[PDB]
Symmetry: C4
Subunit: 334 residues, 4 copies
């Protein structure tokens, strides 16, 4: 297969409508789902010519840890619905490639099983502050023990988003909105973030910030990064594309913490634009799932290599031999 969009159409075939719709969906009318993609098109590239691009180096670092490319795997729940191997395939592919994986909450594999499947792979844990604070506490402890290098706290889901396709055909695995309400605490504030900060010395990244002020607030509370994310357009519909908010957030943080982006990344040029606008790395969600549905582990590895090569070429044609050379002048919005 040639590009990421071919993988989605192949996953559509191999997967039951019920399950493909769950992975594909955005919230309500899917205005933001469409805009995550479209916004990248509105950012035009202004490449520099005649720079030595012979040995294009894609390596960078995420929160102190080296990675082979600024493209890492984002947290998506219930990966075993896409392929029998699920999270284990994902993490093994990340290991092959030298990139990191964010293990999702409601993963279809344990934190321990993931660690063992990819012992040398870079691993981070995505987590919610649950009603039962002890559950959050145990997860953090387990992540520390099992060699996970960061905690991503998702802050944009006091309740689960209203995804129309999920209701039209009811859904379950051994609706979804009720399970979230029982477990995830809608009352949480910056005080509950102070608690999480004292709970661990691991780098914590606030996942799902879309506002400048909230970003400054994250910095003030001693967190170590912002993942600019609209939760794959699955939460509040009508929020801007994450590539559009990224500038405001990059500027608000004033270089004090690393800023990352997910939502809409499907091409090498997407990666380049995000890094030009100031993101340190990007995360992909759906593309990994589509890879998984096609060929499990080899599917994920293929998806990440297609993105890797596309990013290498896009870097080369922009006159960027390494990631440190990328700058704001490479992009301008129409």
């Amino acid at each position: 297969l040639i590009c990421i969009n071919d993988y989605e159409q192949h996953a559509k075939s191999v997967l039951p409508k019920s399950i493909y719709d769950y992975y594909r969906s955005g919230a309500n009318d899917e205005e933001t789902l469409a805009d995550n993609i479209a916004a990248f098109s509105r950012w035009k590239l202004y490449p520099r010519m005649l720079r030595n691009v012979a040995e294009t180096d894609l390596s960078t670092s995420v929160l102190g840890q080296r990675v082979s490319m600024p493209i890492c795997v984002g947290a998506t729940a219930m990966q075993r619905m896409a392929h029998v191997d699920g999270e284990l395939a994902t993490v093994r592919a990340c290991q092959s490639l030298g990139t990191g994986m964010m293990l999702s909450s409601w993963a279809t594999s344990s934190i321990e099983e993931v660690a063992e499947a990819g012992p040398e792979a870079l691993r981070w844990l995505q987590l919610y502050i649950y009603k039962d604070r002890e559950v959050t506490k145990k997860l953090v402890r387990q992540a520390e023990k099992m060699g996970y290098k960061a905690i991503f706290v998702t802050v944009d889901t006091p309740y689960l988003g209203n995804r129309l396709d999920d209701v039209r055909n009811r859904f379950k695995l051994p609706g979804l909105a009720a399970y979230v309400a029982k477990a995830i605490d809608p009352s949480i504030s910056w005080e509950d973030i102070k608690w999480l900060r004292r709970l661990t010395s691991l780098p914590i990244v606030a996942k799902g910030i879309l506002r400048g002020d909230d970003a400054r607030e994250a910095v003030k509370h001693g967190l170590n990064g912002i993942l600019v994310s609209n939760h794959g357009a699955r939460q509040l519909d009508g929020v801007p594309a994450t590539i559009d908010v990224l500038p405001e957030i990059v500027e608000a943080v004033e270089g004090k913490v690393e800023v990352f982006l997910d939502g809409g990344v499907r091409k090498g040029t997407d990666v380049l634009k995000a890094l030009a606008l100031g993101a340190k790395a990007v995360f992909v969600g759906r593309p990994i799932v589509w890879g998984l549905a096609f060929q499990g582990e080899k599917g994920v590895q293929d998806v990440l290599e297609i993105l890797k090569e596309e990013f290498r070429l896009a870097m080369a044609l922009s006159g960027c031999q390494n990631v440190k050379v990328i700058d704001k002048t490479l992009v301008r919005k129409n």
Copy 2:
């Protein structure tokens, strides 16, 4: 049924083309009809994270009177064409929900019958200043006697709008433009508003203002609110979407009177954007009619509950525990 747009398609089935077309239509080319919806999409949401949203309270007040949500039923004529119960179903549903209903002119039920059907429901009367001033005078007196809490004077209809579908297949119930010309006085000015002001101490709201200067003029003449309305895009085609004019009107009124909006509200996020831009409450027109055509009273109650829950979720995901927390920074226009 899941969302408001499903109700319209169901009403299309159950209703004769002649009658569905009457409820659906805008004026001339329906440019504004389309824009009432589309404009909401152009207003993007910038939600705050990590605010306590455990006990989301949707209650507010309209012209001194408490309501359960900032979503109230707008005036639409001839509701018995949609369902045998018409206005009686509508008002009973509003009573169940704790919201208000604007009784329309040319209602298929009397002011007295409506009052009795929903004695404890919040009720307002929509009215025109008719040629025969006594007819207007009696209606006002009746509204005072029957427990109606406000008068909405529609000021945007000196003549009836040209709705193409209404002419293509002639229309009637025991064309429409002739009945309006006989009854509604096209000569009326702010002097006729001075008259209406002295006529009653009930709160009067100017319904159908689209200009800043006209809004200031309404304030100057001692009226108690502005309903920013383009009459469901049924009057002058080529006027802006009401969500677009709302800022100019909110600013022109300088907090001296409450400002409301109708036209295009179909989703919880619509409600949120209107309130963010400064409206106190919104009115829905067509959605109530579609509810009525589907299941009469239960249909209207369902429509309003779908909107209610959608607004609750949208509020929660924006970090708004109550309506007093909503502010201008929640929205920015593309």
Copy 3:
């Protein structure tokens, strides 16, 4: 028939493709043809409420002469291809309605025959400065003798525009680009306009100006008006919609001469927007031809009455009792 767009589809039926295509076409890719219509949609209306609109008066004046409405018939060549009566039907309909007609060059009726068919109708002559100056001279003399009240000099056609459909199927009546090259002088400058000015004391209007500087130049050379026109999008494709250039031209002329508009007028609201932006009257081209193809004289009269009533309603709903009340604040561009 209800609106102007219904007339075009009826004319499509009754006319041979060859002849309908000639009347319909724009130049090259028809970018401007589309934009003449579309631009009107981008101008939004901001109506005033509660102004006495009981006796809406549509009468105004064109170059000193009273007319019943600011909607007049523009010059279109070869009207007998659409209906046996051609120009005679057109002028008789204008007489019925109390509006003016611009007789076209290459009319399928003589200046004398037109004058006799509508003796009391307001008549102007459209003219080119031909290579043979005597032909232009005779036409001017004839127009003076036959009671024509103005000369419209078309200045945007040194050569005929390239209309793709006209070449695909060759065309003729007892190609077209060769006849223009033989007759119309491509060398003409403002000096040839000085000549035309001294030739007659009739009001002369420069037809087809699209630039501010050219408009000032027309004023300087003692002409009496500007018809802002892109020749029905038939000349240079990729020029702006005439409703877009009208502001720049209205401002450049500084109230020294009357300014008119044609191109794209199909609805009453079009007329209103043009007058709001400062035009004194508008001309319609194609709609008259479509009227003619449907019912000859009654067809033209119907077309003009539909426009008349639509303009009356649009005026009323904007709060304009007469044309003198229309002002720039009625419109704002998106």
Copy 4:
């Protein structure tokens, strides 16, 4: 055939999908391919009236050499795939017309064979700085010996662009990305341009610059022109349309060297807009290939004459008797 777009559809018929797709393609999603065309539509024309346009003269000069029109043939590889005569047909047609041809790298004809086929035709050579510097050196020497009047150095291809259709069906003539990597040196910098400058006293034009700073840098290094080009949208997708970047480049160069444009030119009005924005001449790529596929030499000659006449008419209708009269005020962007 009437216009350039008819030629593409005819070439689609006569050519195998494999070969048509190679000539047609852009890079990745073809965002820029579409925008090269679309951007011209966004530049509107503001024609002057009543200027003597009797003897419209289209002649100008490219790098000191007279040409019959500001429309020249751009470099496209492997022209014999389109027609048995290939480059020989192209150059003979340019000779007939009095315009120049840029001979492409990977031409299906030798530099010597081209020179002989069109001895009196204006000829320039397009070239890459190859890994083997001697190959570049020989080409330059040969171009000097064989009467070529300029060297166009393509600077936007350190690696070949990723054209999806080329991979879907593999391609070859007695994939393509491997041949480029073996031959074209991705390491080259402005120092390798200094080398090329000392290598010849022929005018050198930097082909494929899209940035203002890079243009200034080209000027500083003693080059003689900039060809504003995005390589027919075949390299980095998501770069602006060349007509959009042309202003920034024209201004950055401050009249010190001639600036040219290719990419998207299909109509006479395109040529006019490019020259209005400050380009001295434009190059066409694909249209020549489509001409070639239809009727070889007569096909190319037809294509160039259609463009020539369309440009003549567009010039005339703008009030431009010659190319020296074209100015920035003729265009404004929407």
